[PDB]
Amino acid sequence: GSGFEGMFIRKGQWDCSVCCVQNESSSLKCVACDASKP
Amino acid sequence: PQVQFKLVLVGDGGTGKTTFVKRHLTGESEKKYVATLGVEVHPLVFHTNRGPIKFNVWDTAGQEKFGGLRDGYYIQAQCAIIMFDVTSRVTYKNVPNWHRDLVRVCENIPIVLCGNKVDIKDRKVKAKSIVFHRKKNLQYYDISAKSNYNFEKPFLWLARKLIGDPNLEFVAMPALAPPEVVMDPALAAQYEHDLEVAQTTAL
Numbered sequence: 001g002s003g004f005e006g007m008f009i010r011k012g013q014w015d016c017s018v019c020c021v022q023n024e025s026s027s028l029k030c031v032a033c034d035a036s037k038p
Numbered sequence: 039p040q041v042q043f044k045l046v047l048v049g050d051g052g053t054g055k056t057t058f059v060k061r062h063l064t065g066e067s068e069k070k071y072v073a074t075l076g077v078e079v080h081p082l083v084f085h086t087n088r089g090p091i092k093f094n095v096w097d098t099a100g101q102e103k104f105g106g107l108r109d110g111y112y113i114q115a116q117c118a119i120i121m122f123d124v125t126s127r128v129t130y131k132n133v134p135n136w137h138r139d140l141v142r143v144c145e146n147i148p149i150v151l152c153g154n155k156v157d158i159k160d161r162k163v164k165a166k167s168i169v170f171h172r173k174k175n176l177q178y179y180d181i182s183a184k185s186n187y188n189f190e191k192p193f194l195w196l197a198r199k200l201i202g203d204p205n206l207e208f209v210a211m212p213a214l215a216p217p218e219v220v221m222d223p224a225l226a227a228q229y230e231h232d233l234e235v236a237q238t239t240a241l
C-alpha cells in the first residue's frame with residue numbers, strides 16, 4: 001500500500017509528531033525540534 | 039511503514055523557496071508547523087514505480103534573512119535543495135555559504151542546486167556561470183516555481199540517489215497549483231541546451 005518495495009523496518013525508531021524527524025529509541029526528545037518522545 | 043526523507047530547502051531570502059514548495063497542493067494542505075524552530079514541514083508525496091515516497095520539505099519562515107539557521111533546522115536532514123535566484127547574482131554568490139552551513143551539520147547528503155525564476159526574461163545568472171555544482175558533486179536544474187517548470191526534477195534526482203536506483207521513475211506528476219506564468223517552451227529548450235553546452239566545457 002503506502003509501503004515501498006524493499007523497505008526495511010528498524011526497531012524502536014519513532015517519528016516525531018511535530019516535525020516528522022525519525023528518531024532513535026534512546027532519544028527522549030526529538031534531536032531536531034526538541035519535542036518529547038510520544 | 040512508509041518511505042520518507044527530511045529535505046531541507048535553503049537559500050537566500052527572496053529566492054522563491056516558499057513559492058516552490060507550495061506548488062505541491064497536498065504538501066501545502068497537510069503542512070505541519072514546528073513552533074520551536076519556526077518551520078513549516080510540507081509532506082510531498084511522489085508516486086514511483088516502486089511505490090510512494092515522501093519528501094518532508096522544511097521551509098523557513100523567513101529567518102534566513104537575518105543570519106544562518108539553527109542546528110535543529112538542519113539536523114537529520116537526509117537531502118537538500120539549495121536555491122538561488124537567476125535574476126540576482128548575489129544569491130548565487132551565497133550558494134557556497136549555504137552549502138557550508140548544510141554540510142557542517144549533515145555531511146555529504148545528496149544536494150540539488152536550483153536556479154529559480156527562469157521565467158523572467160532578463161536573466162542574470164546564466165548557464166555558463168553556474169559551476170558550483172560541478173565543483174562539489176551536486177546536480178543542478180533551472181526551475182521556475184511560478185510556472186512549475188522542472189518542478190519534479192530535483193525530487194526525482196534525489197529519490198534515485200537516496201534509494202540507490204537509477205531507473206526509479208515517477209509514474210505521474212503530483213497535483214500542482216496551476217502555473218501563474220507561462221514558461222516559454224522554446225526558452226526552456228534553449229536554457230537546457232545552454233546547460234548541456236556548459237557542462238561539456240572546462241571550468
Ligand SMILES: Nc1nc2c(ncn2[C@@H]2O[C@H](COP(=O)(O)OP(=O)(O)O)[C@@H](O)[C@H]2O)c(=O)[nH]1
Nearest residue numbers: 050051052053054055056057155157182183184
Ligand atoms: N517571476 C517569478 N517570481 C517568483 C518565482 N518564485 C518566487 N517568485 C517571487 O519571489 C518573491 C519571494 O518569493 P518567496 O517564495 O517568498 O521566496 P523565499 O523568501 O525564498 O521563501 C516573491 O514575490 C515570489 O512571488 C518564480 O519562479 N518566477
Ligand SMILES: [Mg+2]
Nearest residue numbers: 055056098100
Ligand atoms: Mg520563504
Ligand SMILES: [Zn+2]
Nearest residue numbers: 016019030033
Ligand atoms: Zn521533531
